[PDB]
Design a protein around this ligand. Structure first.
Ligand SMILES: [Mg+2]
Lengths: 1117, 98, 49
């Protein structure tokens, strides 16, 4: 499909009826809806939806008209419009600006007395805009807003077990989009009550009467249930007014018992749409569940007395065990409890809806000021400009993009990491679930996740289960529910019709498995087929009972999980580990696509956006490392600037490079420049290299890994890492700090590489302790000691009042300076208050693979390099080729991740071409293979989808059809094993060893940034203990369990020195340091300050405490 | 010259049993990863797939003697829970001897 | 019993016992290792979470 797609032969045997949709739609569609772009308008009206309203249009219409308390004044908003962005994305990133566009809305002031209308256009501020990649730019940093999973504004019934009596208690709560809650429950004594606005419980009959129902009507409607009649009998309230007064005094205990307010508050609490709203999704859910207004259009989202009575009837029917209910005027609906974890109840707040809510809050704040100062300015001399205060809305938008929990720095470790970050589904966040209520129950795989949330992919951190990844084929219902496609099946023949179903509606049909065998016409060729039914149960049903089928086997998995070959053979835990480790790969200096992979790796590469794609067909006029110029067929000229050695958010290098030649023809959408971690426009997260599966002298013992020195000499696993140091000069109580080259008391050996401005020159190499930016700060009173004055005298030191605070390379860091960015308010640049100049320095280094670095495959097999062997020591094949990596045999079987062996065998088959004989007909094991796989040359990449790829029999047959080597001798036998020689001894190994090619990748857990040490350093002022963390140069923790272990050893002295000398004991610490440096034996400790102060306090309490020596001897000190 | 004959304690949290802290005689190695004797892995419940370890330096003479005598790894062959040996061949070492 | 009722009876020793037991559980949770200074190969669920 992609014009520049390399030919990767595929093992798939099933034809996909639906292509994978745009993977970033989950963001772009939402933002288009928010801004009401014409594209979204057309795509929505195509659905038969008349006059779609954008998010901003919806919010503005809901906000207006704002009417004065007297009705003589009014204000209205409409017609939101957007102009061109101030600057391009790259310029904004380069200048620490925010990618935003002006927002204008037409505002009309109306005076109802004289009829004056004042209509103008009001600037509402700079609204941040989304880029083509589905991300935002704020203050120069790239950020992503992740979708949030939240409970929908429906009505939810449930049953629980009473803690005291162990009885069954049924309850219901009405959850609105905006407003107060309403809930009912049957007590353990069979008493039906209602809680209004979470307040104290009271009989439901009180609420029923307050709505105007008389005792006769209540008896008639609820006579079927004895508990309701008993509650009414025991209800000591009569008449509508008395019940209204009771409710009013319940909700407003401190207000006078006036009848007018008592009647008004109830109407204004639920039933009038000013302060209560179900948001057009809560209304839909309530109508569907209770069977109200069947077939009617959604006219209003307000609550009505009819549905409250219906909810009470539903609760009463549920308590008494009835299964079906019919409401007067409605349609029959089953009576059952609600599983809040079911995606028929959970909905998705996309970026658009979150920004809409923030804008709603801002405009709500604005409305108060507008209506307040409507009553303070002279009438008829009041334009919209005079009272439209846009500060609150801009402040709200800035706060959301700067401090909200959903807007996060994009995970820019590699293209796959960023792509999978944009498609997150986060249950945690404001309006989600409570911080301390994230129990193990919610973070579990419900059956409804199938086809809309991947069960394998999830972070390893504390958010396991709380954060998910959207599936490849899923999409978002305009109500926010996640839909997924299915093929319609009729009379047992699979049809090309595809319908999108939500989890709520999927349970009403029987869904067959994706890869069920079928004939050319589509009819099933089996009597019984595996299907999923209402409860998520998998069973076997006749061929005439199926209703739908999955579009493809890859429906359940996500983008990352779709890139693990032979995913059948890996356990769920190891698949999870591999999927998450794919997100931690660090881009290498030269990327290389895997020999054996999946067809997804192409699309995922393009949809990530890091690859440059030609917009229009044309000829490559000029190509260079920095930019590509294309002349379109229509005469238009395009220029694409490539980003070179740009530092990602996580310190990885984002270097791009072109893959086209001058004069070449490129089709529309063709990839013209490789991304940071792709080759020819497809994912290249790692390197494919030769692996032998055998233990080796114990160097690969306990999941360790052995590497050949070749990988160090050829820069196979080398990666470039860039660090950004920062400093600034601020105003102080003694004055302003200064950046200078004349820093005091340093030899010329130290500042040789500093420029005139005092900043390290570009291109110079720096090592830990080297000065980067020379900075000096004013000091206070000197008051030299006699010794210091003598030193001034004997060196002729003229008085100066500055102290050195120059920026220096942190401990254990080095590299070459590649860039400097300097800002200063004198150049009108925006800076923090009380700051004059700011400097940022970029230091780049070329890290090779070393001992301790973490490597891993795609199947969850991970380890650390325990040894790097000389090339001559590695076991080598009979032709002299030395293997690159050795993996221990004992780690494969018990981990249940045998898919790595499949990858090894298929990679060997791919590296050396194969040729299946057809002289006497196709071999019986080659019947299912497509003809395209009957032959292939060396280094021929192959594809094996996750759930439809190479079979065991096909792979076993292919292993014996590989082409010979240069000399004509086959290295690997039909079993995938080869006879390896010993590099050291030279004798052949007694038994053949499994050999092949494995795709392994370098994780971002390098030892260079994990080693830490501390003899003495800074200390915390609050608690006097050593600081914590590598950045602060802190010490290691010594917990209570370590103290228990030391006590169990009987090592009293070691524990004492750990708790006192190496801890908050200043005098002892200094004494021990002095003794060590001077060679004196370590002084003994004793009598800490805490005991001294405790003893002093005890004495202050007139308690004659004293310390005595021996078993009854005199005092000491 | 300084590092010779100066034991250091190795620890890996959590410390469920006293053998979680053990003294070793340090020797300098290139690179940045600590090298741990295989036979003590079972004691530390550590595998070489990404685990880290903490090192503490005894200072006083009494502390050095305690580490050299009470806490030395070679002196803790037997587990304290049941007296059965703990630093014995495992995994690869078994397969060879078998 | 309906006519007389109860004089808003409350218990004090039971509340003290509950408070002490909850404090002991909090101390037990604090005794465990924190996420800031784990030594495992990768982050994982802790009891405190
Ligand atoms: Mg581990």
């Amino acid at each position: 499909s992609v014009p520049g797609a390399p030919n990767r032969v595929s093992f798939a045997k099933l034809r996909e009826p639906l292509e994978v949709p745009g993977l970033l739609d989950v963001q772009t569609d939402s933002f288009e809806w928010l801004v009401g772009s014409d594209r979204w308008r057309q795509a929505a009206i195509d659905r038969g939806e008349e006059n779609p309203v954008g998010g901003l249009e919806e919010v503005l219409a809901e906000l207006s008209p704002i009417e004065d308390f007297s009705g003589s004044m009014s204000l209205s908003f409409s017609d939101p419009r957007f102009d061109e962005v101030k600057a391009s994305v790259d310029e904004c990133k380069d200048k620490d600006m925010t990618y935003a566009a002006p927002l204008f809305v037409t505002a009309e002031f109306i005076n109802n007395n004289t009829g004056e209308i004042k209509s103008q256009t009001v600037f509402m501020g700079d609204f941040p805009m989304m880029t083509e990649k589905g991300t935002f730019i704020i203050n120069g940093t790239e950020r992503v807003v992740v979708s949030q999973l939240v409970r929908s504004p429906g009505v939810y019934f449930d049953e629980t077990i009473d803690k005291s009596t162990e009885k069954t208690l049924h309850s219901v709560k009405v959850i609105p989009g905006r407003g107060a809650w309403l809930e009912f429950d049957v007590d353990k004594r069979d008493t039906v009550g209602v809680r209004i606005d979470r307040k104290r419980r009271q009989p439901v009959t009180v609420l029923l009467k307050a709505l105007g129902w008389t005792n006769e009507q209540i008896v008639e409607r609820f006579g079927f249930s004895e508990i309701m009649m008993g509650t009414l009998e025991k209800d000591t309230t009569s008449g509508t007014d008395e019940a209204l007064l009771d409710i009013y005094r319940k909700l407003r205990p401190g207000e006078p018992p006036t009848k007018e307010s008592a009647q008004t508050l109830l109407e204004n609490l639920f039933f009038k749409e000013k302060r209560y709203d179900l948001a057009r999704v809560g209304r839909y859910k309530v109508n569907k569940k209770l069977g109200l207004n069947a077939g009617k259009p959604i006219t209003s989202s307000t609550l009505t007395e009819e549905d409250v009575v219906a909810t009470i009837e539903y609760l009463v029917r549920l308590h008494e065990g009835q299964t079906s209910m019919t409401v007067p005027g409605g349609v029959e609906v089953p009576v059952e409890v609600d599983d809040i974890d079911h995606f028929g109840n959970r909905r998705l707040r996309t970026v658009g809806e979150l920004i809409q809510n923030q804008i709603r809050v801002g405009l709500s704040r604005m409305e108060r000021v507008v209506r307040e100062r409507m009553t303070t300015q002279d009438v008829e001399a009041i334009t919209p400009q005079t009272l439209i205060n846009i500060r609150p809305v801009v402040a709200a938008i800035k706060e959301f993009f700067g401090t909200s929990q959903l807007s996060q720095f994009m995970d820019q470790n590699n293209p796959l990491s960023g792509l999978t970050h944009k498609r997150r589904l986060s249950a945690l966040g404001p309006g989600g679930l409570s911080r301390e209520r994230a129990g193990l129950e919610v973070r579990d795989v419900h059956p409804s996740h199938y086809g809309r949330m991947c069960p394998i992919e999830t972070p390893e951190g504390p958010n396991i289960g709380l954060i998910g990844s959207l599936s490849v084929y899923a999409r978002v219902n305009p109500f926010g529910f996640i839909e997924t496609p299915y093929r319609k099946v009729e009379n047992g023949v699979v049809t090309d019709q595809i319908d999108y179903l939500t989890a709520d509606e999927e349970d009403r049909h029987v869904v067959a498995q994706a890869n069920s065998p079928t004939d050319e016409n589509g009819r099933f060729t089996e009597d019984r087929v595996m299907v999923r039914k209402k409860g998520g149960e998998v069973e076997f049903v006749s061929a005439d009972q199926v209703d739908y089928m999955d579009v493809s086997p890859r429906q359940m998995v996500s983008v990352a999980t779709a890139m693990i070959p032979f995913l059948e053979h890996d356990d769920a835990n190891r698949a999870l580990m591999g999927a998450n480790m794919q997100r931690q790969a660090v881009p290498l200096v030269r990327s290389e696509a895997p020999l054996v992979g999946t067809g997804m790796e192409l699309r995922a590469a393009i949809d990530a956006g890091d690859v440059v794609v030609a917009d229009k067909t044309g000829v490559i006029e000029e190509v260079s490392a920095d930019y590509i110029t294309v002349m379109a067929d229509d005469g238009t000229r395009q220029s694409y600037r490539l980003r070179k050695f740009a530092r990602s958010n996580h310190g990885t290098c984002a270097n791009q490079r072109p893959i086209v030649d001058a004069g070449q023809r490129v089709e529309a959408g063709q990839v013209i420049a490789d991304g940071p971690c792709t080759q020819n426009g497809e994912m290249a997260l790692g390197k494919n290299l030769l692996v032998a599966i055998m233990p080796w002298e114990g160097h690969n013992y306990e999941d360790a890994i052995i590497l050949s020195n070749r990988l160090v000499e050829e820069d196979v696993l080398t990666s470039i890492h860039i660090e950004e140091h920062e400093i600034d000069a601020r105003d102080t109580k003694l004055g302003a700090e200064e950046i200078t080259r004349d820093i005091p008391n340093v030899s010329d050996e130290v500042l040789a590489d500093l420029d005139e401005r005092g900043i390290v020159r570009i291109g110079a190499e720096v090592r830990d302790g080297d000065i980067l930016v020379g900075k000096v700060t004013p000091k206070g009173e000197t008051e030299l000691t006699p010794e210091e004055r003598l030193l001034r005298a004997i060196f002729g030191e003229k008085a100066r009042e500055v102290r050195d605070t120059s920026l220096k390379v942190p401990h254990g860091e080095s590299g070459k300076v590649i860039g400097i960015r300097v800002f200063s308010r004198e150049d009108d640049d925006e800076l923090p208050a009380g700051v004059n100049e700011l400097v940022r320095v970029y230091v780049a280094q070329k890290r090779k693979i070393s001992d301790g670095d973490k490597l891993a495959g795609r199947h969850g097999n991970k380890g650390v390099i325990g040894k790097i062997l000389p090339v001559e020591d590695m076991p080598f094949l009979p032709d002299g080729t030395p293997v690159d990596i050795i993996l221990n045999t004992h780690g494969v079987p018990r981990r249940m991740n045998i898919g790595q062996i499949l990858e090894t065998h298929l990679g060997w088959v791919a590296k050396a071409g194969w040729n299946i004989d057809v002289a006497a007909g196709v071999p019986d094991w080659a019947s299912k293979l497509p003809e395209e796989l009957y032959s292939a040359p060396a280094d021929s990449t192959v594809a094996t989808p996750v759930f439809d790829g190479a079979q065991e029999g096909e792979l076993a047959g292919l292993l014996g059809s590989t082409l010979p080597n240069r000399d004509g001798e086959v290295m690997v036998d039909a079993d995938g094993k080869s006879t390896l020689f010993d590099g050291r001894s030279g004798e052949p190994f007694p038994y053949p060893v499994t050999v092949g090619y494995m795709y392994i990748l370098k994780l971002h857990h390098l030892v260079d940034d994990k080693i830490h040490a501390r003899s003495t350093g800074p200390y915390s002022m609050i608690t006097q203990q050593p600081l914590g963390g590598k950045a602060q140069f802190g010490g290691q923790r010594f917990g209570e369990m370590e103290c228990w272990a030391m006590q169990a050893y009987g090592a009293a002295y070691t524990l004492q020195e750990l708790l006192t000398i190496k801890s908050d004991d200043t005098v002892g610490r200094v004494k021990v340091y002095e003794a060590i440096v001077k060679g004196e034996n370590i002084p003994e400790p004793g009598i800490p300050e805490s005991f001294k102060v405790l003893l002093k306090e005890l004495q202050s309490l007139c308690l004659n405490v004293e310390v005595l020596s021996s078993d009854g001897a005199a005092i000491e000190m | 010259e300084v590092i010779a004959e100066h034991p250091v304690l190795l620890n890996r949290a959590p410390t469920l049993h006293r053998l979680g802290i053990q003294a070793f005689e340090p020797q300098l190695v290139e690179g940045k990863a600590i090298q741990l004797h295989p036979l003590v892995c079972e004691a530390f419940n550590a595998d070489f797939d990404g685990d880290q370890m903490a090192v503490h330096l005894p200072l006083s003479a009494e502390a050095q003697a305690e580490a050299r005598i009470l806490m030395l790894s070679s002196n803790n062959i037997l587990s304290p829970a049941s007296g059965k040996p703990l630093a014995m061949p495992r995994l690869d070492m078994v397969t060879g001897l078998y | 019993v309906d006519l007389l009722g109860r004089n808003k009876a409350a218990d004090e020793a039971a509340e003290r016992e509950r408070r002490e037991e909850e404090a002991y559980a909090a101390g037990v949770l604090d005794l465990m290792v924190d996420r800031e200074d784990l030594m495992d190969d990768e982050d994982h669920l802790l009891a405190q979470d």
